[PDB]
Design an enzyme around this catalytic site. Structure first.
Site, PDB file in Angstrom:
ATOM      1  N   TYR A  26       4.350 -10.987   0.236  1.00  0.00           N
ATOM      2  CA  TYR A  26       4.845 -10.288  -0.850  1.00  0.00           C
ATOM      3  C   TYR A  26       5.297  -9.028  -0.629  1.00  0.00           C
ATOM      4  O   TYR A  26       4.619  -8.111   0.184  1.00  0.00           O
ATOM      5  CB  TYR A  26       3.968 -10.244  -2.171  1.00  0.00           C
ATOM      6  CG  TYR A  26       2.987  -9.313  -2.133  1.00  0.00           C
ATOM      7  CD1 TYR A  26       1.606  -9.667  -1.802  1.00  0.00           C
ATOM      8  CD2 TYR A  26       2.805  -7.712  -2.576  1.00  0.00           C
ATOM      9  CE1 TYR A  26       0.572  -8.808  -1.670  1.00  0.00           C
ATOM     10  CE2 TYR A  26       2.022  -6.741  -2.595  1.00  0.00           C
ATOM     11  CZ  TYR A  26       0.757  -7.318  -1.971  1.00  0.00           C
ATOM     12  OH  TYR A  26      -0.073  -6.712  -2.016  1.00  0.00           O
ATOM     13  N   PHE A  36       6.171  -0.098  -3.001  1.00  0.00           N
ATOM     14  CA  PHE A  36       5.065   0.399  -3.408  1.00  0.00           C
ATOM     15  C   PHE A  36       3.786  -0.863  -2.428  1.00  0.00           C
ATOM     16  O   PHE A  36       2.872  -0.133  -2.365  1.00  0.00           O
ATOM     17  CB  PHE A  36       4.758   0.421  -4.703  1.00  0.00           C
ATOM     18  CG  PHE A  36       4.899  -0.802  -5.372  1.00  0.00           C
ATOM     19  CD1 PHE A  36       3.373  -1.526  -5.583  1.00  0.00           C
ATOM     20  CD2 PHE A  36       5.877  -1.212  -5.973  1.00  0.00           C
ATOM     21  CE1 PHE A  36       3.735  -2.722  -6.341  1.00  0.00           C
ATOM     22  CE2 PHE A  36       5.914  -2.586  -6.694  1.00  0.00           C
ATOM     23  CZ  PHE A  36       4.708  -3.125  -6.904  1.00  0.00           C
ATOM     24  N   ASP A  37       4.172  -1.808  -2.209  1.00  0.00           N
ATOM     25  CA  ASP A  37       3.151  -2.693  -1.660  1.00  0.00           C
ATOM     26  C   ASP A  37       3.814  -3.720  -0.602  1.00  0.00           C
ATOM     27  O   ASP A  37       4.981  -4.242  -1.078  1.00  0.00           O
ATOM     28  CB  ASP A  37       2.271  -3.432  -2.526  1.00  0.00           C
ATOM     29  CG  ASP A  37       0.962  -3.810  -2.148  1.00  0.00           C
ATOM     30  OD1 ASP A  37       0.633  -3.454  -0.893  1.00  0.00           O
ATOM     31  OD2 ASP A  37       0.216  -4.458  -3.009  1.00  0.00           O
ATOM     32  N   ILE A  56      -1.989  -9.778 -11.120  1.00  0.00           N
ATOM     33  CA  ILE A  56      -1.292  -9.299 -12.310  1.00  0.00           C
ATOM     34  C   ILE A  56      -0.866 -11.037 -12.770  1.00  0.00           C
ATOM     35  O   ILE A  56      -0.484 -11.779 -11.882  1.00  0.00           O
ATOM     36  CB  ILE A  56      -0.279  -8.524 -12.093  1.00  0.00           C
ATOM     37  CG1 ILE A  56       0.457  -8.817 -10.738  1.00  0.00           C
ATOM     38  CG2 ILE A  56      -0.719  -7.221 -12.046  1.00  0.00           C
ATOM     39  CD1 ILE A  56       1.771  -7.646 -10.459  1.00  0.00           C
ATOM     40  N   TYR A  82       0.583  -4.490 -15.334  1.00  0.00           N
ATOM     41  CA  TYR A  82       0.115  -3.315 -15.348  1.00  0.00           C
ATOM     42  C   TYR A  82       0.292  -2.473 -16.561  1.00  0.00           C
ATOM     43  O   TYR A  82      -0.256  -1.336 -16.856  1.00  0.00           O
ATOM     44  CB  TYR A  82       0.566  -2.376 -14.262  1.00  0.00           C
ATOM     45  CG  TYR A  82      -0.322  -2.815 -12.964  1.00  0.00           C
ATOM     46  CD1 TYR A  82      -1.364  -2.682 -12.809  1.00  0.00           C
ATOM     47  CD2 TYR A  82       0.416  -2.723 -11.797  1.00  0.00           C
ATOM     48  CE1 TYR A  82      -2.246  -3.114 -11.821  1.00  0.00           C
ATOM     49  CE2 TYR A  82      -0.142  -2.876 -10.679  1.00  0.00           C
ATOM     50  CZ  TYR A  82      -1.595  -3.278 -10.737  1.00  0.00           C
ATOM     51  OH  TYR A  82      -2.218  -3.261  -9.398  1.00  0.00           O
ATOM     52  N   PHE A  99       9.215  -8.269  -6.996  1.00  0.00           N
ATOM     53  CA  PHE A  99       8.169  -8.869  -5.770  1.00  0.00           C
ATOM     54  C   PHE A  99       9.087  -9.816  -4.995  1.00  0.00           C
ATOM     55  O   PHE A  99       9.993 -10.693  -5.548  1.00  0.00           O
ATOM     56  CB  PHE A  99       7.244  -9.536  -6.210  1.00  0.00           C
ATOM     57  CG  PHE A  99       6.072  -8.640  -7.011  1.00  0.00           C
ATOM     58  CD1 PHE A  99       5.258  -7.950  -5.994  1.00  0.00           C
ATOM     59  CD2 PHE A  99       5.965  -8.283  -8.039  1.00  0.00           C
ATOM     60  CE1 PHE A  99       4.254  -7.067  -6.607  1.00  0.00           C
ATOM     61  CE2 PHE A  99       5.309  -7.689  -9.064  1.00  0.00           C
ATOM     62  CZ  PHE A  99       4.242  -6.870  -8.276  1.00  0.00           C
TER      63      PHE A  99
END
Lengths: 107, 434, 263, 592, 186
Positions: A26, A36-37, A56, A82, A99
């Site tokens: 992802y 961010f990831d 999540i 979140y 994502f």
């Protein structure tokens, strides 16, 4: 609160089910476009179990609707991602997360 | 003056105060580094004794009172109106000198910085005003580096005010240094300060400069330069195809780049306009290029999702056919022979157009330009001319880099100056009037 | 001939650097000379290391590993500012150490690791912080005092090692004497357990440290309890609550093993 | 280079390629510019596309003054022509913009009232065209980041526009989107009464609705017919294009009108709920200029182009990956290559101090903050910064420090804390430990051997942000330690050989910048204990080839190092001595 | 360079003389290198005196006397291992009534006008310990009840006799040879 858009097609027959782990890569982005990831940054496929509240929600239903080998974009609204509090230090409050998820293998 | 007594009756020793403040700053001036060790240590001893005597006589509170009386007036013009012009030009200088004197009085003195903790809360309340920001920040830095109790008393509101100083006053590395002092002092880490600074600064991604790795994107174009202009001999419909022999979805941690479409030139120069020569920018990343990535229509660095049968990102063995209509500005695409339900319309047609592909590493694509330069897999739409028909009669069609610099030896690199305009591309007949 | 030995190589390199250049960095000079002295004092390394060397049985390897992890957490908490989560981590680590078997079976390892000293610096930092405003973080101070008293009770030599720090505990005895439910968990209680039922330690006990306790008792007999009058207790001139604490410490100081130490 | 001019400069990196040096220049004693440089010299050229930058205080033509806003006057920025009416005066059109943009809503919705002011997203700024300034030469409105058009004659007709029409399957155009970089209006056409009025200057006011994207203009209290609808998430910079016909040209007025929020309330998130107009020092006037340099990349993508046949057309093939690290300026919506900070001092300083703050917020084992920082700075960015040879020295040192602090410092400190204690389990291999490897009383290589003393346990947690667990906030974030080890050994091997040649261009610009971060990372890895057996042999061979050879080229110890590098070498030798002492202690326990 | 490092550390102002292991070791090394410690002939005695002079010169030619004065002055009258090593080094460099070292110390003191040196000397004398009947009786009782002392020295009585003797031997060596200058300066 999650919609799925296909970047690359999958087999269309194999889908995640209860008690079966999902191996995915992802790349999470915000709507502003800032990453961010990314497990691809870590060279480290991400493994989680369906129905065990390990990730999540938006990611959970996105992976659930995705099929084996499929690459899809997951847009997770704050209610399923979140919430209002956000992730301290990473995700701003009331943030919608995008994502790029590829369902590698179901095992 | 505050109680509104008449200005001449009130005596205001502006010049003497300024000269004494200069004298006091020189008196508390720290020793220079080039001096020998013995002289340096003796001068540090003298400075320490001076600071101790001043703090024991309570000279810090006197300076604070003077600073408060001066901040009662909101600006130099306001002070000039209340007292007079002569105090008006000196208000700013006196404030700066007083803040410098306070910094000199407290610098390097642990006891003085410990006793200034009680007044630190009052100090930060005036950080936002521009006439005292630098002096207040310097005083705060001195107290933070010297006295641990400063970090103990600094709270979430003070940290947020310091952070908002960066937002309102712009980038200043001294605020970052003060924040680092708030995080670590004398080898002891304040977890509360660290967490507050992180959670109030990092998630915004609007003040600190952001870093990322971007794949290099290169653009390749044919020789043809096709445009439209009134009274000119060039066909206004063109067609070409790009078919991908191979593409790697992820050659690196970032997704591969593969965009196809048309691009325009600013004016009649052969230069692709609106974009930088090197970087991660490709077709559709400016208002001069018009691209298609298999799922989005790209223009002006903004993408819009366009539907198509079995829509997907550009894969191996995919035929993309591009159509350009200069009669009514229209760029349309057809993937694998079926139409793509979207098009670019009403764009600028002043400049010249040309086919273009933008790509990162991990591609294998082939231009089918028609004629003897590749056979179209799908039949062109009616009225469209293959791109190979736009070549000038003497020139030879070839696919080259869109930008003028490529990979080669530095000493063999051909540095290129400005090129001459290609107005010859549009042949407008102009016989003399008779 | 080539150096062929790390000691010779380091000695030659240090002397060669120093004689080539006048080093402008005092830290570099000190590092070079410490290293050279270490090369020339190979015996001193063993003299320093052997007292800190312990041999454990193979059955207790993982248990000692867990104890060392807990001690490392406590030691790492020394370099951070005191807080709620730090208090929680310290309390958990002390609990793990006290519930761990090596703490009982190997008191010498515990003393060699300097665990009681580490708990002492933690308590020192917390007692210094907020000394005027009662005492901040009283719970972990109580936990550290209980750990230290139990460390005294474990072994006789541990009691002497704790006795070597009795001076500090006396000027910071007046911390939680007035507050109830903290009894047995104060620096005064730690100092009392440091001499409890030990003739040698009672005899080694000096005069000035007893004078300090007598001074504190005199102060408690003269002036009242500020905390008690703030909470609303009637203002009597003297402080029985802390006076009794100092009295029982003096009781443990003067009476040992059923007999009275006349000195 | 002039028009249609081609040239080549040879810096003499390869002396053989110089064609006239020998006949004229070698005997005289001159040297090639790249006489002993290991890598190619970075090459800087004049930038083609103009960019917006703050007006210099020493600009010969443009002067910008900041009039503070009183109780009855809005804050104002006044643009004045310094050299009007004199020789060398510049008559061409200047393009002005404000530093910060208005960011429209991500998703579009489908006696002033305080509640309306607090719930609204509509922002306002106004421009006063001064008397005597010809209004048809002045344009007021908004521009995006894409505006780089510098034309002597600017007209609203030649703005760059595109219309994306998304249609359904049957072909009906269900949606049409107009896109442009410039959304501005002209004052000459705005004047319906016309001419010059000095009761008040020509006052075009710009109204932006951040929730709907509607751009409406008000001129002298009456709404103009021109309106613009923009896309969601569009960043709009207030902009004024004007040609100077007077010393006083125009003025930015940052005030507010009825039921419309001030520009500062949208520009700054801190003042989002403050109706009072404000002009913070960050806001400043910028102008389009050609005075900027552009850095040629050292390496370009390798592209192979060739026509296979008449049937197959032309083939374009690019198979080798290449990346550059991009620094994004948040306020200007602009991104530049991080290697361009070598000539941009203020950004370099600010980013170095930002890296220092990143290291400080996660100092002394703040694992949660380190996990948070893993999002902002990731493994690929860290590795690219570590390995890149053209990185500025300050950024190089900062990125080495950040990499050590986020991933390695906690366990390095743990083993340093446990270093002086020797708890030796008494096992069979412990009994097998001996002082000397064989009957020959020759010391083995320090570190290499069988150590049985109890050591701290290495544990790391993967920094995943999609997970909702909290157990990962203990233990430092995971890093590819094997890759780090191999790359560190490779980089040390390169540095030892290259630095001995004493090149003019070390990595980071100085020998200290080249060696101190690299040797510090190597020392941190050694302290942790990743280096095993062959790695220890190679690194000891690097430190001193002669002494640590198994039972020429100079090592680090005798290569004339700076004092900071000497301190690191002293630390390394101290660690080696500590390893020898630990081996001695274990051998004594074995004999016992 | 080592002597200069130690001298600069001594000359830096701190509230207390910090215990430095490097100084505590290298001062001992220096003192031993000086002293290097049945009838002997005149030639043997003369050779020993000359060798001692050379070994003392190797240090007082590089600032050892000023270093040992500075360390004592920075001690501020606090008895400890730092002054214990400094006094031994001073004795080592002053053994035999070294006139050159005496002159160097007197010149340094007069030039720097150091009052802290003499104040620290007075403080060290005040802090010097003597016989203690209370401690003697307490340790006698401890031995009588059978508790054997872990340390056999029993140094509670006469805490630092070596330190006291070293201090007074240093102050005697300062004046040996009928050095009227120090005799009056003290």
């Amino acid at each position: 609160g999650v919609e799925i858009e296909t970047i690359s097609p999958g087999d269309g027959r194999t889908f995640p089910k209860k008690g079966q782990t999902c191996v995915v890569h992802y790349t999470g982005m915000l709507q502003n476009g800032k990453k961010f990831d990314s497990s691809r940054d870590r060279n480290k496929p991400f493994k989680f179990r369906i129905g065990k509240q390990e990730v999540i929600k938006g990611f959970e239903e996105g992976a659930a609707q995705m099929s084996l080998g499929q690459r899809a974009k997951l847009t997770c609204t704050p209610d399923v991602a979140y919430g209002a509090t956000g992730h301290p230090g990473v995700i701003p409050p009331n943030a919608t997360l995008i994502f790029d998820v590829e369902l590698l293998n179901l095992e | 003056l505050s109680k509104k007594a008449k200005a001449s009756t009130v005596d205001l020793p502006i010049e003497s105060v300024s000269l004494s403040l200069q004298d006091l700053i020189g008196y508390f001036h720290p020793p220079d580094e080039h001096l020998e060790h013995e002289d340096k240590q003796n001068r540090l001893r003298a400075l320490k004794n001076r600071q101790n005597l001043f703090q024991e006589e309570g000279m810090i509170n006197l300076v604070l009172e003077c600073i408060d009386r001066l901040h009662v007036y909101s600006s130099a013009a306001h002070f000039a109106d209340v007292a007079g012009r002569e105090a008006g030009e000196s208000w700013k200088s006196i404030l700066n000198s007083l803040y410098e004197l306070l910094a000199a009085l407290i610098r390097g003195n642990r006891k003085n910085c410990a006793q200034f903790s009680g007044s630190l809360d009052w100090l930060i309340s005036r950080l936002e005003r521009l006439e005292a920001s630098s002096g207040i920040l310097e005083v705060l830095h001195c107290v933070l580096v010297e006295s641990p109790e400063a970090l103990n008393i600094i709270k979430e509101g003070h940290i947020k005010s310091i952070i908002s100083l960066l937002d309102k006053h712009g980038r200043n590395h001294k605020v970052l240094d003060v924040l680092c002092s708030l995080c670590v002092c004398h080898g002891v880490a304040v977890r509360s300060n660290q967490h507050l600074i992180c959670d109030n600064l990092l998630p915004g991604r609007d003040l600190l400069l952001q870093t990322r790795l971007v794949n290099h994107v290169s653009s390749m174009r044919p020789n043809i330069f096709l445009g439209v202009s009134e009274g000119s001999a060039q066909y206004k419909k063109w067609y070409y195809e790009l078919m991908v022999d191979h593409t790697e979805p992820f050659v690196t941690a970032e997704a591969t780049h593969l965009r196809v479409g048309w691009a325009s030139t600013e004016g009649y120069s052969p230069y692709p306009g609106g974009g930088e020569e090197w970087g991660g920018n490709g077709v559709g990343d400016d208002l001069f290029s018009y691209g298609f990535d298999g799922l989005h229509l790209w223009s002006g660095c903004i993408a819009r999702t366009v539907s198509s049968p079995n829509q997907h990102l550009l894969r191996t063995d995919d035929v993309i056919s591009c159509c350009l209509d200069l009669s009514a500005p229209s760029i349309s695409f057809r993937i694998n022979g079926q139409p793509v339900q979207g098009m670019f319309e009403n764009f600028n047609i002043d400049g010249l157009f040309f086919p273009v592909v933008s790509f990162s590493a991990g591609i294998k694509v082939r231009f089918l330009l028609g004629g003897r330069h590749g056979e179209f897999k799908f039949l062109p739409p009616p009225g469209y001319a293959p791109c190979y028909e736009a070549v000038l009669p003497k020139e030879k069609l070839k696919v080259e880099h869109s930008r003028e610099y490529k990979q080669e030896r530095t000493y063999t690199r051909d540095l290129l100056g400005p090129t001459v305009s290609l107005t010859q591309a549009a042949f407008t007949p102009i016989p003399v009037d008779t | 001939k080539k150096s062929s030995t790390l000691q010779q190589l380091i000695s030659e390199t240090m002397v060669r650097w120093a004689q080539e250049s006048v080093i402008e960095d005092p830290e570099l000079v000190r590092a070079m000379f410490v290293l050279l002295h270490r090369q020339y004092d190979g015996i001193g390394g063993l003299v320093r290391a052997l007292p800190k060397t312990y041999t454990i049985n193979g059955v207790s390897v993982e248990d000692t590993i867990n104890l060392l992890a807990s001690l490392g957490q406590i030691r790492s908490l020394l370099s951070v500012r005191m807080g709620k989560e730090e208090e929680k981590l310290m309390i958990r680590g002390l609990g793990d150490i006290m519930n761990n078997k090596v703490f009982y079976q190997h008191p010498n390892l515990m003393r060699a690791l300097g665990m009681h000293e580490t708990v002492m610096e933690v308590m020192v930092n917390v007692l210094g912080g907020g000394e005027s405003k009662e005492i901040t973080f009283p719970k972990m101070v109580a936990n550290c005092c209980r750990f230290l008293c139990y460390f005294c009770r474990i072994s006789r030599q541990n009691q002497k090692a704790m006795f070597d720090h009795l001076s500090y505990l006396l000027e910071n005895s007046s911390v939680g004497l007035a507050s109830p439910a903290m009894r047995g968990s104060t620096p005064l209680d730690v100092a009392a357990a440091s001499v409890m039922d030990n003739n040698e330690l009672a005899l080694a006990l000096r005069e000035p440290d007893l004078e300090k306790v007598v001074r504190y008792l005199a102060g408690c007999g003269l002036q009242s309890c500020q905390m008690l009058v703030s909470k609303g207790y009637p203002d009597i001139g003297w402080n029985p609550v802390e006076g009794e604490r100092y009295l029982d410490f003096l009781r443990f100081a003067v009476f040992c093993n059923g007999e009275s130490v006349e000195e | 280079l002039g028009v249609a001019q081609v040239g080549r400069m040879n810096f003499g990196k390869d002396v053989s390629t110089l064609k006239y040096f020998t006949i004229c220049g070698l005997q005289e004693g001159y040297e090639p510019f790249a006489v002993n440089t290991n890598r190619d010299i970075t090459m800087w050229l004049s930038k083609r596309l103009p960019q917006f930058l703050q007006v210099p205080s020493n600009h010969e033509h443009i002067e910008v003054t900041r009039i503070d806003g009183t109780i009855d006057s809005s804050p104002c920025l006044k643009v004045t022509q310094k050299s009007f009416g004199s020789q060398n005066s510049n008559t061409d059109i200047m393009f002005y913009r404000l530093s910060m943009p208005i960011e429209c809503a991500e998703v579009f919705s489908k006696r002033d009232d305080y509640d309306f002011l607090m719930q609204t997203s509509t922002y306002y700024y106004s421009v006063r065209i001064f008397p005597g300034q010809e209004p048809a030469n002045v344009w007021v409105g908004w521009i995006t980041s894409d505006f780089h058009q510098y034309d002597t004659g600017f007209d609203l007709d030649r703005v760059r526009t595109v219309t994306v029409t998304l249609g359904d399957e049957k072909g009906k155009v269900h949606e049409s989107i107009k896109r442009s970089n410039c959304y501005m209006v002209c004052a000459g056409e705005s004047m319906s009464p016309g001419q010059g009025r000095n009761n008040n200057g020509l006052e075009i006011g710009c109204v932006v609705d951040a929730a709907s994207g509607l751009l409406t203009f008000i001129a002298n209290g009456k709404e103009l017919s021109t309106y613009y609808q923009v896309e969601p998430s569009t960043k709009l910079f207030p902009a004024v294009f004007a040609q100077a016909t007077s010393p006083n040209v125009f003025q930015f007025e940052l005030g507010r009108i009825k039921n419309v929020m001030p520009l500062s309330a949208g520009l700054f998130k801190s003042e989002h709920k403050n109706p009072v107009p404000q002009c913070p020092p960050r806001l400043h006037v910028q102008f389009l200029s050609h005075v900027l340099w552009s850095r040629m990349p050292n390496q370009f993508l390798k592209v192979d182009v060739s026509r296979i046949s008449e049937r197959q057309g032309w083939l374009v093939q690019c198979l080798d990956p290449l990346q550059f690290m991009s620094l994004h300026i948040p306020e200007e919506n602009r991104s530049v290559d991080i290697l361009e900070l070598t000539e941009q001092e203020e950004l370099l300083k600010f980013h170095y101090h930002t890296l220092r703050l990143y290291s400080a917020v996660c100092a002394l084992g703040n694992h949660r903050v380190a996990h948070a920082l893993c999002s902002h700075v990731d493994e690929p960015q860290l590795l690219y910064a570590i390995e890149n040879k053209y990185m500025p020295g300050l950024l190089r040192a900062g990125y080495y420090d950040l990499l050590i602090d986020i991933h390695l410092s906690s366990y390095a400190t743990a083993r340093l804390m446990m270093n002086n204690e020797y708890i030796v389990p008494m096992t069979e291999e412990t009994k097998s430990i001996t002082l000397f490897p064989d009957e020959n009383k020759k010391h083995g290589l320090p570190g290499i051997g069988l150590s049985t003393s109890l050591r701290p346990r290495m544990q790391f947690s993967s920094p995943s942000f999609v997970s909702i667990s909290n157990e990962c906030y203990q233990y430092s974030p995971e890093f590819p330690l094997d890759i780090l080890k191999s790359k560190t050994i490779q980089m040390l091997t390169e540095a030892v050989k290259e630095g001995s040649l004493h090149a003019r261009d070390p990595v980071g610009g100085t020998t200290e910048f080249l060696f101190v971060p690299l040797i510090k990372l190597f020392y941190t890895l050694l302290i942790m204990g990743i280096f095993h057996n062959e790695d220890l042999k190679h690194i000891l061979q690097l430190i001193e080839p002669s002494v640590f050879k198994e039972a020429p080229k100079e090592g680090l110890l005798q290569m004339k190092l700076p004092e900071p590098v000497k301190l690191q070498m002293c630390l390394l030798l101290q660690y080696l001595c500590d390893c020898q002492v630990r081996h001695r202690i274990e051998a004594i326990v074995a004999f016992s | 360079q080592l002597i200069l490092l130690f001298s600069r550390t001594a000359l830096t102002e701190k509230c207390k003389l910090e215990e430095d292991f490097l100084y505590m070791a290298y001062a001992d090394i220096m003192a031993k290198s000086c002293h290097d410690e049945e009838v002997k002939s005149f030639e043997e005695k003369e050779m020993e005196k000359q060798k001692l002079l050379y070994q003392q010169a190797r240090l007082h030619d590089r600032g050892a006397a000023e270093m040992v004065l500075q360390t004592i002055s920075a001690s501020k009258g606090e008895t400890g291992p730092m002054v214990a090593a400094t006094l031994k080094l001073g004795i080592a460099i002053l053994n035999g009534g070294n006139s050159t070292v005496q002159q160097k110390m007197l010149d340094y003191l007069k030039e720097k006008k150091d009052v802290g040196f003499f104040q620290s000397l007075a403080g060290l004398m005040q802090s010097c310990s003597v016989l203690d009947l209370n401690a003697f009786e307490r340790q006698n009782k401890a031995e009588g009840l059978g508790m054997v002392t872990e340390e056999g020295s029993g140094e509670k009585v006469l805490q630092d006799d070596e330190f006291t003797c070293d201090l007074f031997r240093f102050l005697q060596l300062l004046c040996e040879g009928h050095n009227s200058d120090f005799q009056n300066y003290l």
